[PDB]
């Protein structure tokens, strides 16, 4: 199956440069253009440029003239984009995509996309999250179901990964988008289970913050 695999997330301080990759399988790597696109949160997609592996032909958007350059290694079926002199406005998700095969009509659309590579550029320093259990009010729980929560406060940068009971709890989960205040993020997640399931059976949120190399498990305890 035709596929584009992009490299993992990057956290860079401004002024640095970053080089992300895009491995293409399985087709004739030199028979299609590789395209590069940028998506900042709150903005539409921006076209960066394109490269034809093998021939080495390159085209770039003028808005990225001195910012992005492309390369394609035909022996490894891998395309590369490098970004120089990074600033806050370079923080975005970057997609590689294959330019569909076209004839005289010049139908220049993308027929396969990579999953994207997140680049975060900031001078704020990584901070590990505090993970806080949300147990229901000491009072009653009349209903047939009970909702528990997990509050992930004061971390940077995005993202965190949150699961419940190591992922074996997926129904009834709402993980809410993080909110930014000052230079720190806060994230909440709720899980709703049958009243007979908790507290008789344990419930734990599992939080991973790769940028700080941190993992936290918090078992939700009844308050009394």
């Amino acid at each position: 199956q035709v596929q584009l695999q992009q490299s993992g997330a990057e956290l860079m301080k401004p002024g640095a440069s970053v080089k992300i990759s895009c491995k293409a399988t399985g087709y004739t790597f030199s028979g299609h253009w590789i395209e590069w696109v940028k998506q900042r949160p709150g903005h539409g997609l921006e076209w960066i440029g394109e490269i034809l592996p093998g021939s080495g032909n390159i085209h770039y958007n003028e808005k990225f003239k001195g910012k992005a350059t492309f390369a394609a290694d035909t022996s490894s079926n891998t395309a590369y984009m490098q970004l120089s002199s990074l600033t806050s406005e370079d923080s975005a998700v970057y997609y590689c995509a294959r330019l569909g095969t076209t004839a005289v009509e010049r139908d220049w659309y993308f027929d396969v996309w990579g999953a994207g590579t997140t680049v975060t550029v900031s001078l704020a320093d990584p901070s590990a999250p505090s993970v806080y259990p949300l147990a229901p009010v000491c009072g009653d729980t009349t209903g047939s179901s009970v909702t528990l929560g997990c509050l992930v406060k004061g971390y940077f940068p995005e993202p965190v990964t949150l699961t419940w009971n190591s992922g074996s709890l997926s129904s009834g989960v709402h993980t809410f988008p993080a909110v930014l205040q000052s230079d720190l993020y806060t994230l909440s997640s709720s899980v709703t289970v049958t009243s007979s399931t908790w507290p008789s059976q344990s419930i734990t949120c599992n939080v991973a913050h790769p940028a700080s190399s941190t993992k936290v498990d918090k078992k939700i305890e009844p308050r009394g």
Binding site: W108, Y109, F110, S130, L134, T147, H174, F176, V179
Partner: protein, 214 residues
């Protein structure tokens, strides 16, 4: 650059309905236009190229029309899986430019929010903080209002809210609201109240607790 404008940010349709997404180009691009579908978190896929030609494998429920500057993607017999973002792309001139996208919402039956309030954990209080969290889960339609009360009087500052995308399984929306005080402030009051107002009732859904209880 040629600016591609999708003036509708959201749209709603019932299963079986017919709905249309519009895309406006700032200059004449003839028929050189493509449409894409991007499901949440998933990789975008091509639907239409050359304004009206379906990409291979795309159901015939997807039709495209227009040429010059005004383009329309029409989705007939809307299905559950069609819950996604749709955006256009011009390729009449380089640099290629895209529209900002239009999210398709699925209509469903009205549903009041399920409200839960949570006091600050003893862990957070140990560090001098005190966040009160209120979940408002699985309601429809998306518009909702949250009001915090401390000792019976409204409280506005220190509140941060977060909303989910439409759930792909039951088509509801959820919201999280967090009131953050210092421990010093938090221990100077007794009653903390979360109040949810939703079109399904003039009476707000009220969840509350007292620092007394246990």
């Amino acid at each position: 650059d040629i600016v591609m404008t999708q003036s509708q940010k959201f749209m709603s349709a019932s299963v079986g309905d017919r709905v249309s997404v519009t895309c406006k180009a700032s200059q004449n691009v003839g028929t050189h236009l493509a449409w894409y579908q991007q499901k949440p978190g998933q990789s975008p896929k091509a639907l239409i190229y050359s304004a009206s030609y379906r990409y291979s494998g795309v159901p015939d429920r997807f039709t495209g029309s227009g040429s010059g500057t005004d383009f329309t993607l029409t989705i007939s017999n809307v299905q559950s899986g069609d819950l996604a973002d749709y955006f256009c792309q011009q390729y009449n001139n380089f640099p290629l430019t895209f529209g900002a996208g239009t999210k398709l919402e699925i209509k469903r039956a009205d549903a009041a929010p399920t409200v839960s309030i949570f006091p600050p954990s003893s862990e957070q209080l140990t560090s001098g903080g005190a966040s009160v969290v209120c979940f408002l889960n699985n309601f429809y339609p998306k518009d909702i209002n949250v009001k915090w009360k401390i000792d019976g009087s409204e409280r506005q500052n220190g509140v941060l809210n977060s909303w989910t995308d439409q759930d792909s399984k039951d088509s509801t929306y959820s919201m999280s609201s967090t009131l953050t005080l210092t421990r010093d402030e938090y221990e100077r009051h007794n009653s903390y109240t979360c109040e949810a107002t939703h079109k399904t009732s003039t009476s707000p859904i009220v969840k509350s607790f007292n620092r007394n209880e246990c």
